[PDB]
Amino acid sequence: KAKLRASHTWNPIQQMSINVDNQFNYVPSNIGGMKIVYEKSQLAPRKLY
Amino acid sequence: GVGISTGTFNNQTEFKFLENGWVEITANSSRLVHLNMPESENYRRVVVNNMDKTAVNGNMALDDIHAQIVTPWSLVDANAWGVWFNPGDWQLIVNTMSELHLVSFEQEIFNVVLKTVSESATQPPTKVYNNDLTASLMVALDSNNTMPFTPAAMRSETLGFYPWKPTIPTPWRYYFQWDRTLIPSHTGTSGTPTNIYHGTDPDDVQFYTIENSVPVHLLRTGDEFATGTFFFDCKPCRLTHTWQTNRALGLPPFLNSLPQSEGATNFGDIGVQQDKRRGVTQMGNTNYITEATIMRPAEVGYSAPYYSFEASTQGPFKTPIAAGRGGAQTDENQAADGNPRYAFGRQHGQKTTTTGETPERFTYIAHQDTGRYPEGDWIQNINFNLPVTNDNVLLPTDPIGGKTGINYTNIFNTYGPLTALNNVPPVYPNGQIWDKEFDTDLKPRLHVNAPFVCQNNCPGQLFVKVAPNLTNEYDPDASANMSRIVTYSDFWWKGKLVFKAKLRASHTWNPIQQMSINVDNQFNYVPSNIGGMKIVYEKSQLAPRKLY
Amino acid sequence: GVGISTGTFNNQTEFKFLENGWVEITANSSRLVHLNMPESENYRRVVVNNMDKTAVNGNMALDDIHAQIVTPWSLVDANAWGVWFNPGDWQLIVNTMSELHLVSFEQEIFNVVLKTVSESATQPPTKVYNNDLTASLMVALDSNNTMPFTPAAMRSETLGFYPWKPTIPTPWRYYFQWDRTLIPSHTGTSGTPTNIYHGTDPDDVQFYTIENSVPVHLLRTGDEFATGTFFFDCKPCRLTHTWQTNRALGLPPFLNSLPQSEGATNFGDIGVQQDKRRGVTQMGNTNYITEATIMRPAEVGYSAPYYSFEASTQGPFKTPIAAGRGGAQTDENQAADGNPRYAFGRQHGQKTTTTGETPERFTYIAHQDTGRYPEGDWIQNINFNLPVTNDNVLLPTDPIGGKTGINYTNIFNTYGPLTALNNVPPVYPNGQIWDKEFDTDLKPRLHVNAPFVCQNNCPGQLFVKVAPNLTNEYDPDASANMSRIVTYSDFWWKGKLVFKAKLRASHTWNPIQQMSINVDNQFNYVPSNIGGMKIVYEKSQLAPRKLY
């Protein structure tokens, strides 16, 4: 069960995104080699107090 | 009343999730508008003739001759992305929604104030500001859309983009018919090409006044004004880009040989002679079936003449294109046609604290691959004998008209009954949101300036003006100029735009492209020690969508 | 309206006795708040770097480097005891109640006034004050507690403590993420320890604006504003102190010999050999049962590292402790860690008529005996051979790390599953009343700055600001600074705090410690011939309570 996030700052947040450097970690090789690079999970900030 | 506020400030954008992944975005925007009395209290019919500049052969594109009506009214325009969303909100929309629907619009004027500048021409000449309690602000909402439509965003003249910075409306003016003739030439064109401003076709004449057409409201401090809610009529806006070219449609060729080893050079291979393959083509006289040759269902994108100026009744004008290029080949350096360029000020993105009057600018390179590399184009004689022979090919390299800097691609047009294209993507924050359709029998399939065109009905424009604050002396029959008390007004403007969006769903194994802050852009989203602010533009159809 | 007051002054605290010894205290506080336009109308992102000061080896604790956002808004904070009760009321609570419950809070803004200073730069340059009748005060109540929580009491920046003295709000500012590295050193540390301000982690960035987050209210003279009633969620506060140490828990030893005569030296005597007594201990290898040795059920208080600075992502910080010491051994001279120190001004206790800018201060020595005399501590080898031998003991006297001014007590920690402690007592009048819990997975068992922490819900902060009073000249695209009419506002603030208390009952033969005026403190509760006022701090858990 998840809850959707809401923006609260003027500035954007840190999001996970594919890019020219990681791109090939998400698709097979000509050999069919596969890999599953690890990722981070609490990317956005929250105020503590 | 006098000591009573008539409104509330609200610049909060609410996101309210419904059922089945539909959100209802309601953008609240509030500003303090500052307004001065008019230069004059008259309608002026003015012509702009820069003949001198076009007088130089080879400078036709520098043409600015036009006629316009100058009015004593100001336009309150809030149709630009930056007025309603901040970098924060844009990230939310753009990274998580897949389509946008513009639903409605409302705006209201409150907490009106009128003051009069009194100068006590002293040693150090002084001036006292006093409240004119019985003075009036004049408001006119052209809801029947009588007046000619003038989107202030094509001039970077919208309300400003920051809720804690007061703003101002623009002086309203509109085009008045004129007739002008300009013959193109070039550097070293013997003579002086005709360059004539003929004047006005009487049957094309339309002088409009606000006073005669819209009901005018006088608001005093105690008053307030509110437009009601207007609903738009518009097809939804997609928040995704397409990437498939004619070259990537349908079933790829079956590879009879597959790489055995990993390696950037370990390719697979179709195993069949290009002249011995099965499949369909539209080259009735050839047995070659290649990826450039095999049949595709229609064509994605089209070729159009580039840096093409056309001419009608009023001077030359640039031929518009639905999409430019950029990617593998175009960056700022691989500069082309079709990509829009935005110039603007401190109120709309140029760094606040920056000194200097050069506009801030940017060329927008979308993400949908629907354009062209004219350099890769070629025409070739129907016999199709292959290593084609210099005179059975027309290359972007051979000159047309004997001009060495012109090739057939500049005059080329491949638009036709199989053309498939997409409407224009949103440009945050400088782009216009909605546009009025042309009241033309046949209409344009798109508008290159707004993703939303309202057909049957658009919100009308809002005009404002300080009413005349006369002095004791006033003689209407004097050929002079009416003397007025120096008055100005400050009022609060509150607008409300509602959207409907749908949430995106992952469909691939691999992640998507998302907007994110990072060590290189970070400082573009926070103030300076000086309080300098800036609003860097962003892209909007970041995620891919399959075309077919 | 213009000639109509919109509110009432009320600074009366009512005590309403219910049934079964429950009182319902309702504290009314009213002040006249004075407010000026902002330095700027912008949000500013500023860094504070006193590198120069830390540049001296041995001065790390003098670190002040931080980044913060400076906002054009002011904060109205009334969370300090002194805002709601006077010395008189405090005596009543503290001498006769045994527990306090914070129930609710309400505040409202009325009788708003805005004036504009006009200077008639004359010989003796003059200035006229005039009322700006249509001007507005801007009020924002962050009830969803969006903005970061900034209790003005940790800076002695609350409303003032006297109902007949006008006050002012504080400029609101909040911390902005930064990265800094500082290596400790000492007098004569060869070299220059790294002392670096690295900058901002982009993923830790959060720029907040009031305008984009809270609904803003414009109030003109005729207007008024009122927060509604907020109910807090908080465990009760005890008004009694405990005095029992591990040493005083349970059944004392039965004395086989009792004094026969009165006399400060006529002691009674256990009659049994310490190694021949019955009872329980946790010293499995010993037959000695003494009062230092016999088993107690848990431990009252704990030992924590002292004058311990810890370091994380943003610089060093002092390790906090739940209770200090004082009593038999500590007074001002027997100075220790854990006791809070308060510094403040004329608005919060420093004598009014006193000239000079040194803050007024005080170190609070509570009354609950739950702390430690580190000097009485000792570690001793498990063999327990008794007149312990210098190398089977670690005394607060032996040096650690070869430093002669450091002993194991400074790095010591005896907190564990048997620790029993009490929350912090109230500090009248400079102490904060309530505090916001940390939005952390695991929370702190207490807060050393307020006896009341509201968990699930706290009242939101109140922000105020003079709206921009522009002049005739205003150009939003100028890189200059907006020119405004010198405006200021005075408004009345009325707040209402309700408590629930329970009345105390005598349970001992002997009287209790009560707060009382006397020939030595008397003059601290009345004005000077000059009208000088002062507000000496007081203690709150005067009566004892049994722990077990």
Listing DSSP states for C421-472 in one string gives --PPPP-BTTS--EEEPP-SSSPPS--SS-SEEESS--PPEEEEEEPP-B-S
CB-CB neighbours of C224 under 10 Å: 17
Is the CB of A33 inside 8 Å of chain B's CB atoms? yes
Q: What is the distance between the alpha carbons of residues B300 and B372, in angstroms, rounded to a whole number?
A: 10
CB-CB neighbours of C326 under 10 Å: 21
Is the CB of C121 inside 8 Å of chain B's CB atoms? yes
> Cα separations (Å) of A21 from A18, A24, A25, B369, B513?
8, 8, 9, 21, 12
User: Are B531 and C40 within 8 A, CB to CB?
Assistant: yes
B301 in Cβ contact with B372 (< 8 Å): yes
Q: What is the distance between the alpha carbons of residues B285 and B392, in angstroms, rounded to a whole number?
A: 16
For chain C, the farthest-separated pair of C-alpha atoms sits apart, in whole angstroms, at 99
CB within 8 Å of B341: residues ≥ 6 apart: B361, B362, B363, B364
Dihedral sign (CA B333, B338, B339, B342): positive
DSSP B466-512: EPP-B-S---TT-SS---B--EEEEEEEEEEEEEEEEE----SSSPP
Nearest alpha carbon to residue B313 among B216, B188, B181 = B181
Is the CB of A9 inside 8 Å of chain C's CB atoms? yes
| Residue B197, H or E segment | strand B195-199
Chain B contact set for C477 (CB, 8 A): 345-347
Nearest alpha carbon to residue B390 among B404, B400, B380 = B380
Nearest alpha carbon to residue B237 among B84, B93, B423 = B423
C317 in Cβ contact with C311 (< 8 Å): yes
Q: What is the distance between the alpha carbons of residues B348 and B346, in angstroms, rounded to a whole number?
A: 6
Q: Which amino acid is at B102?
A: L
Nearest alpha carbon to residue A9 among C177, C498, C459 = C177
DSSP C24-64: EEEEEEEEEEEEEPPS-SS-EEEEE--HHHHTSTT-GGG--
Q: Which residues 365-394 of B are in CB contact (within 8 Å) with A?
A: none
Nearest alpha carbon to residue C425 among C491, C370, C353, C480 = C370
Q: What is the distance between the alpha carbons of residues A29 and A26, in angstroms, rounded to a whole number?
A: 10
Residue B343 forms beta bridges with which residues?
B361
Dihedral of CA atoms B375, B381, B385, B386 in degrees, nearest 10, equals 0
Q: What is the distance between the alpha carbons of residues C295 and C179, in angstroms, rounded to a whole number?
A: 49
N-term to C-term CA, chain B: 62
Nearest alpha carbon to residue B232 among B105, B142, B143 = B105
DSSP B357-370: -PPEEEE---SS--
C170 in Cβ contact with C79 (< 8 Å): no
Backbone angles phi, psi at C278, to 5 degrees: -100, 165
C398-419 core/surface letters (b: 16 or more CB in 10 A; e: else): eeeeeeeeebbbbebeeeeeee
Which residue do the tokens 């010591």 mark?
Answer: C412
Show the DSSP H helices in B99-223 as ranges.
Answer: 210-213
Query: According to the annotation, is B10 in a ligand binding site?
Result: no
Please give the angle made by the CA atoms of B188, B193 and B194, to the nearest 5 degrees.
170
Q: What is the distance between the alpha carbons of residues C252 and C248, in angstroms, rounded to a whole number?
A: 8
In whole angstroms, what separates CA C280 from the centre of its chain? Answer: 42
Residue C102 forms beta bridges with which residues?
C499
Show the DSSP H helices in B397-440 as ranges.
Answer: 408-411
Q: SS3 of B204, please?
A: helix
Chain C contact set for A46 (CB, 8 A): 439
Q: What is the distance between the alpha carbons of residues B116 and B300, in angstroms, rounded to a whole number?
A: 61
Count structural domains, chain B.
1
Which residue do the tokens 């005729």 mark?
Answer: C222
User: Are B2 and C205 within 8 A, CB to CB?
Assistant: no
Chain breaks in chain B (C to N over 2.5 A) after: none
B422 in Cβ contact with B370 (< 8 Å): yes
Nearest alpha carbon to residue B268 among B253, B248, B284 = B253
Q: SS3 of C292, please?
A: coil
Q: What is the distance between the alpha carbons of residues B85 and B427, in angstroms, rounded to a whole number?
A: 12
B381 in Cβ contact with B393 (< 8 Å): yes
Q: Looking at residue B342, what DSSP letter applies?
A: E
Q: What is the distance between the alpha carbons of residues B120 and C118, in angstroms, rounded to a whole number?
A: 12
User: Are C439 and A14 within 8 A, CB to CB?
Assistant: no
Q: What is the distance between the alpha carbons of residues A24 and B206, in angstroms, rounded to a whole number?
A: 62
Q: Which amino acid is at C495?
A: G
Q: Looking at residue B352, what DSSP letter applies?
A: T
Give the structural domain span for C252: 1-548
B467 in Cβ contact with B136 (< 8 Å): yes
CA distance to partner chain B, nearest, from residue C215 (Å):
5
User: Are A8 and C208 within 8 A, CB to CB?
Assistant: yes
C462 in Cβ contact with C71 (< 8 Å): no
B494 in Cβ contact with B163 (< 8 Å): no
User: Are C207 and A10 within 8 A, CB to CB?
Assistant: yes
B33 in Cβ contact with B491 (< 8 Å): yes
B543, with CB counted inside 10 A (0-12, 13-18, 19+), is: buried
Nearest alpha carbon to residue B174 among B128, B205, B199 = B205
Q: What is the distance between the alpha carbons of residues B459 and B231, in angstroms, rounded to a whole number?
A: 8
CB within 8 Å of B348: residues ≥ 6 apart: B80, B82, B156, B158, B160, B161, B429, B430, B535
Is the CB of B160 inside 8 Å of chain C's CB atoms? yes
C114, C116, C134, C144, best to mutate vs chain B, most B CBs in 10 Å: C134
CB-CB neighbours of C282 under 10 Å: 9
Q: What is the distance between the alpha carbons of residues C426 and C428, in angstroms, rounded to a whole number?
A: 6
N-term to C-term CA, chain C: 62
CB-CB neighbours of B391 under 10 Å: 8
B116 in Cβ contact with B262 (< 8 Å): no
Q: Which amino acid is at C28?
A: N
Q: What is the distance between the alpha carbons of residues C104 and C231, in angstroms, rounded to a whole number?
A: 4
Chain B contact set for A10 (CB, 8 A): 86-88, 525-526
Nearest alpha carbon to residue B515 among B424, B428, B449 = B428
Is the CB of B492 inside 8 Å of chain C's CB atoms? yes
Of B3, B167, B528, the CB nearest to C45: B528
Q: What is the distance between the alpha carbons of residues C465 and C219, in angstroms, rounded to a whole number?
A: 10
Q: What is the distance between the alpha carbons of residues C515 and C541, in angstroms, rounded to a whole number?
A: 10
Nearest alpha carbon to residue B174 among B49, B79, B64, B70 = B70
User: Are A31 and B513 within 8 A, CB to CB?
Assistant: no
Q: What is the distance between the alpha carbons of residues B222 and C518, in angstroms, rounded to a whole number?
A: 60
Of B115, B488, B522, the CB nearest to C200: B522
Q: What is the distance between the alpha carbons of residues B59 and B50, in angstroms, rounded to a whole number?
A: 11
Tokens of A13: 């947040």
Q: What is the distance between the alpha carbons of residues B219 and B223, in angstroms, rounded to a whole number?
A: 5
Q: Which amino acid is at A33?
A: G
Computed over its alpha carbons, how large is the radius of gyration of chain B?
Answer: 29
> Cα separations (Å) of B260 from A32, B256, C192?
10, 12, 59
User: Are B517 and A12 within 8 A, CB to CB?
Assistant: yes
User: Are A10 and C146 within 8 A, CB to CB?
Assistant: no
B72 in Cβ contact with B182 (< 8 Å): no
Is the CB of B518 inside 8 Å of chain A's CB atoms? yes
Q: Which amino acid is at C203?
A: D
Backbone angles phi, psi at B60, to 5 degrees: -50, -40
Computed over its alpha carbons, how large is the radius of gyration of chain A?
Answer: 16
Question: Half-sphere exposure of C32 toward its Cβ, with a 13 Å CA cutoff?
Answer: 7
> Cα separations (Å) of C474 from B119, B165, B352?
17, 11, 15
C95 in Cβ contact with C515 (< 8 Å): yes
User: Are C439 and A47 within 8 A, CB to CB?
Assistant: yes
Of C202, C208, C439, the CB nearest to A9: C208
Q: What is the distance between the alpha carbons of residues B323 and B542, in angstroms, rounded to a whole number?
A: 16
B396 in Cβ contact with B409 (< 8 Å): yes
* Contacting partners of chain A (3+ CB pairs under 8 A): B, C
> Cα separations (Å) of B25 from A3, B39, B64, B101, B301?
17, 40, 41, 10, 32
Q: Which amino acid is at C40?
A: S
Computed over its alpha carbons, how large is the radius of gyration of chain C?
Answer: 29
Q: Looking at residue B257, what DSSP letter applies?
A: B
Q: What is the CATH number of the domain that holds B103?
A: 2.170.30.10
Is the CB of C132 inside 8 Å of chain B's CB atoms? yes
Q: What is the distance between the alpha carbons of residues C493 and C487, in angstroms, rounded to a whole number?
A: 19
Tokens of C252: 């004392």
Residue of C nearest to A11 (CA): C207
Q: Compute the residue count for chain A.
A: 49
Q: How was this structure determined?
A: X-ray
Nearest alpha carbon to residue B468 among B37, B15, B16 = B37
